[PDB]
Design a protein around this ligand. Structure first.
Ligand SMILES: [Ca+2]
Length: 507
């Protein structure tokens, strides 16, 4: 048996893992998206199932006012000690955020606690449980790493933060984790940046408090030295040890199109870690995270496939569905028209930093088909609803039903650099159901419509123009249902009977 990387696709950056007996749990960063910090579950490190989110409530994910793509939830760390799971991270820019927080749970599916604010703004806070102590390791935004000890109950520092080590020469020392393995305490961290020079490095000491000395086989993992490789910007790893004693790393990376641009976001990868004779870890001979590997020494456990169609025919919204900042439940219902997701477009659109009536999911494949049957009668030109390809608040493609010159129409509208650049309309019948459809390849999104007396490819757009390299920030594309009255509320609701999502990267 083998597996193909990546192990979790679509926007899933900054992976943090822990093993609790036969079960593995993993979290990734979410930024402005709610619920925050999804928790995935596996029994083989390869097949992952979404089971909850660490931040499923507005009191533990305050997001209002945060910037798209550079605000909200940054790298989380996930750990487990004495019947209790802990997730620590940083919230930047949300009204009511005090910076670094953690939340706890007995069940990793939830419910999680309200935040325990630790009282600083350090990025990439990490925790580890060693010798009956809860260590807190973070960078100091000045090239150095700070270690401290923390009371699990209160989040207060019992031993205060102090400098113990620093980065090893590379840009933006990030993502430090603390491990006690054999004779030594190890600080493993990321350097180089967000780009091609990203790498994981390690150092160790006889004592937690230093001094630390660098690995002679740095880096631990990087695709820096293979510019041909289909995976790039590999880094921000977290280690996990199995019951057979062997070691695996999860880390983030990108899958560029023609080696130039990435739009799906930073995804999660899996690589075997080997320790050399002197006690230093490395992935392979060269540190390169490969496309396929021999399977972990664990029994294969494939999860029941999620169906293509969400029929919106139960009271509980599927866990993959995602909102922008803190959603008011007043804009959506699965109750009010049973069998449909009812979306009520408000005055709010993307141009502010609160929560527009948007519900979407991560584009988890280059090649896909996404479609939705929607009932929407607009009464005036400002009113619209349909599907959106979102990169951020300034960059998104809108496949919407609206009213133009007393005709109900289907519209593809391309917004880039916060300006509308292209708009193409086709006339719909005055009433009746409309199937809106978005199909994707590595390079192109194609937008299609179907109704009574109306079926047509409406337009195309580039994946390149929504890519990280053009738009900046720390996110990747979401495809979602959308309604907005652009200054006014929509008169009528937009009712989505179903939503198909088909990933086709295997073929
Ligand atoms: Ca339905």
């Amino acid at each position: 048996k083998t597996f193909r990387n990546p192990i979790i696709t679509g926007m899933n950056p900054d992976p943090s893992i822990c093993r609790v007996g036969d079960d593995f749990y993993l979290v990734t960063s979410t930024f402005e998206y709610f619920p925050g910090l999804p928790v995935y579950h596996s029994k083989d490190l390869v097949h992952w199932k979404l089971i909850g989110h660490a931040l499923s409530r507005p009191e533990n994910n305050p997001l209002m006012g945060c910037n798209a793509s550079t605000g909200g939830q940054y790298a989380p760390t996930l750990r487990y000690h004495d019947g209790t799971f802990y997730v620590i991270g940083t919230n930047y820019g949300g009204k009511g955020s005090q910076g670094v927080f953690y939340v706890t749970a007995k069940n990793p599916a939830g419910p999680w606690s309200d935040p325990v604010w630790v009282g600083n703004w350090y990025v990439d806070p990490s925790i580890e449980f060693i010798d009956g102590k809860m260590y807190f390791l973070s960078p100091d935004n000045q090239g150095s790493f700070l270690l401290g000890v923390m009371d699990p109950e209160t989040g207060t520092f019992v031993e205060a933060l102090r400098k113990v080590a620093s980065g090893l020469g590379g840009s933006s020392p990030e993502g430090p984790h603390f491990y006690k393995i054999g004779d030594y305490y190890y600080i493993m961290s990321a350097e180089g940046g967000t780009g091609y020079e990203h790498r994981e490095v390690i150092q160790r000491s006889k004592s937690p408090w230093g001094p630390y000395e660098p690995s002679p086989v740095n880096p631990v993992l990087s695709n820096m030295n293979c510019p041909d490789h289909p995976f790039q910007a590999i880094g921000h790893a977290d280690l996990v040890q199995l019951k057979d004693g062997s070691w695996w790393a999860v880390c983030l990376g990108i899958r560029p199109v023609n080696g130039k641009y990435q739009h799906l976001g930073r995804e999660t990868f899996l690589a075997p870690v080997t320790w050399d004779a002197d006690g230093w870890p490395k992935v392979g001979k060269d540190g390169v995270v490969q496309e396929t590997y021999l399977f972990p020494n664990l029994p294969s456990h494939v999860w029941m496939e999620q169906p293509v169609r969400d029929d919106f025919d139960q009271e509980t919204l599927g866990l993959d569905w995602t909102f922008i900042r803190n959603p008011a439940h007043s804009f959506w219902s699965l109750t009010e028209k049973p069998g449909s997701l009812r979306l009520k477009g408000t005055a709010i659109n993307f141009t502010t930093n609160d929560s527009p009536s948007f519900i979407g999911r991560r584009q988890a494949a280059f090649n896909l088909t996404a479609s939705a049957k929607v009932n929407f009668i607009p009464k005036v030109e400002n009113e619209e609803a349909g599907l959106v390809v979102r990169a951020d608040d300034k960059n998104h493609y809108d496949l919407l039903i609206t009213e133009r010159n007393g005709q109900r129409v289907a519209m593809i509208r391309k917004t880039l650099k916060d300006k509308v650049v292209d708009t193409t309309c086709k006339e719909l019948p005055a009433t009746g159901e409309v199937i809106l459809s978005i199909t994707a390849t590595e390079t192109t999104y194609t937008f299609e419509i179907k109704a009574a007396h109306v079926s047509a490819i409406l337009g195309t757009a580039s994946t390149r123009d929504v890519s990280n390299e053009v738009v900046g920030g720390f996110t990747g594309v979401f495809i979602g249902m959308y309604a907005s009255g652009n200054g006014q509320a929509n008169t009528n609701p937009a009712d989505f009977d179903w939503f198909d999502f088909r990933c086709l990267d295997l073929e």
